[PDB]
Amino acid sequence: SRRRVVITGMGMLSPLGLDVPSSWEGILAGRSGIAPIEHMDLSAYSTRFGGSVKGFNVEEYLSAKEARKLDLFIQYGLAASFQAVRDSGLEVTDANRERIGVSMGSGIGGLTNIENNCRSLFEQGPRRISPFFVPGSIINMVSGFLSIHLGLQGPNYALTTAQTTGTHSIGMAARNIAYGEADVMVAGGSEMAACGLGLGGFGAARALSTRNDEPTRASRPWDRDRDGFVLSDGSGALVLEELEHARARGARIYAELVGFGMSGDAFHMTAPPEDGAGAARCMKNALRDAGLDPRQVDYINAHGTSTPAGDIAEIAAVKSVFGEHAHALSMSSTKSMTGHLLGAAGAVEAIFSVLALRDQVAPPTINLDNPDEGCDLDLVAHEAKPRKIDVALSNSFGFGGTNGTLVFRRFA
């Protein structure tokens, strides 16, 4: 029968820091992690900035000879995963290794590596493709390499649900534990899509902000002057653990994962419906799953991408689900500061939602200078808001009409 699931460990690389505390300090201070991209020449591109991980040292985690064969999305995913496992205090033994698994996802995975090998193929030939091309690039290898390094023999898989990946990964991992398929899961996501194909591809779709001359002000969810999302890199990982398992070993419990919702829009390959009907169905599924009155919700970490259609669909969904309570909860987009980490967005934002619960503070939506028509909720404009938070919701929506909602609450 269905078991309870708590969060005992968290790990992060973000545009705001190389761990969780440094990232959360930036969040509460309203700091932007967005800047012109330094790692490649983008003069031919319509967008030349994003949220890079700054000063990442993979040799804090892995030998250079290994790191050299792994795409950055794997390196980031492993770094966050190692942080989360160390943060949990869990010791992997012969007695528990079959009961610990991993579900770390990505939207696009090792596009940098694939692009670089495609260049070798076209300019030189197939004789110059890296022997590590497949295991160093494909999405399931965060889960794979983490299991090899820590000895995890439980369920080993990866989700790829575009911008919903991190949320689905955590929710599905929580169901594994709930249903008895595992006692512990490391779950979240990682992304590094800032290569020519990624920036060029999102650029060709005209999905990105082109605020090149003022990158820190580009991501402005629900602001009338928003012009699309800001591409960002990094990783979030959480250690999810069955409650009695956590209690038995005296684990520090950050919060309880009480609800998970999924739904499909069945509307459009890339556009969200204006009424946010799929997002509403998803949140209602999650609140029913959590056994909650919707009035219990204190804080929503929105998807809040800074796209024209996405931001207004989320206001419409929150008003539909919460009615008059929509005006009492606080909702913010931390993508205002981090930008959009794509398949990692739901992972870092689950962590921010747990820290909102730990610290009793709603992170700000920076850059919300002029809220757009209908954007008249408490969106925590500009400055962090200390407040009572017993229940926090994290929402994600993605290409394919794919929706995910996580519901966290304080654990006594």
Ligand X SMILES: CC(=O)N1C[C@H](C)Oc2c(F)cccc21
Report 188-217 residues binding a second copy (CB under 8 A): 196-207
Distance CA 406, CA 402 (A): 14
216 vs 270 by CB, closer to a second copy? 270
31 vs 69 by CB, closer to ligand X? 69
164 vs 365 by CB, closer to a second copy? 164
- Which partner from the list a second copy, ligand X, none does 60 bind, CB cut-off 5 to 8 Å by kind? ligand X
Q: Looking at 308-357, which runs of residues are DSSP E strands?
A: 330-332
Under rule CB under 8 A, residue 159 binds a second copy: yes
In the complex, least distance from residue 277 CB atom to ligand X, rounded to whole angstroms: 17
Binding mask 112-151 for ligand X (x = CB under 6 A): ------------------------------------x---
Q: Please list, residue by residue across 208-221, b when 16 or more beta carbons sit within 10 angstroms of its beta carbon and e when fewer do.
A: bbebeeebbbbbbb
Distance CA 102, CA 81 (A): 9
| Residue with the two structure tokens 């939506």 | 365
- Which partner from the list ligand X, a second copy, none does 402 bind, CB cut-off 5 to 8 Å by kind? a second copy
* Binder among 5, 66, 233, 367 for ligand X (CB under 6 A): 66
Q: Which of residues 17-46 bind ligand X (CB under 6 A)?
A: 19
| Residue with the two structure tokens 């060029």 | 200
- C-beta neighbour count of 127 within 10 angstroms: 7
3 state SS of 402: strand
* Binder among 73, 82, 299, 352 for ligand X (CB under 6 A): 82
- Half-sphere exposure (Cβ direction) of 96: Cα atoms closer than 13 Å: 14
- Which partner from the list ligand X, a second copy, none does 82 bind, CB cut-off 5 to 8 Å by kind? ligand X
In the complex, least distance from residue 39 CB atom to a second copy, rounded to whole angstroms: 15
Quick one: tokens of 165?
Answer: 């990946």
- Which partner from the list a second copy, ligand X, none does 312 bind, CB cut-off 5 to 8 Å by kind? none
Residue 385 to residues 217, 312, 376, Cα–Cα distance (Å)? 20, 22, 17
- Which partner from the list ligand X, a second copy, none does 336 bind, CB cut-off 5 to 8 Å by kind? none
* Binder among 21, 60, 86, 179 for a second copy (CB under 8 A): 179
Contact region for a second copy (CB under 8 A) — 44-52, 56-64, 245-253, 348-356? 44-52
Under rule CB under 6 A, residue 67 binds ligand X: no
Quick one: tokens of 327?
Answer: 């005006």
- Which partner from the list a second copy, ligand X, none does 133 bind, CB cut-off 5 to 8 Å by kind? a second copy
Strands 5-13 and 234-242: antiparallel
Q: Is the separation of the CB atoms in 72 and 127 below 8 Å? A: no
- One-letter amino acid of 75: Q
Strands 184-191 and 234-242: antiparallel
Q: Which residues bind ligand X (CB under 6 A)?
A: 19, 60-61, 63, 65-66, 69, 82-83, 86, 148, 269
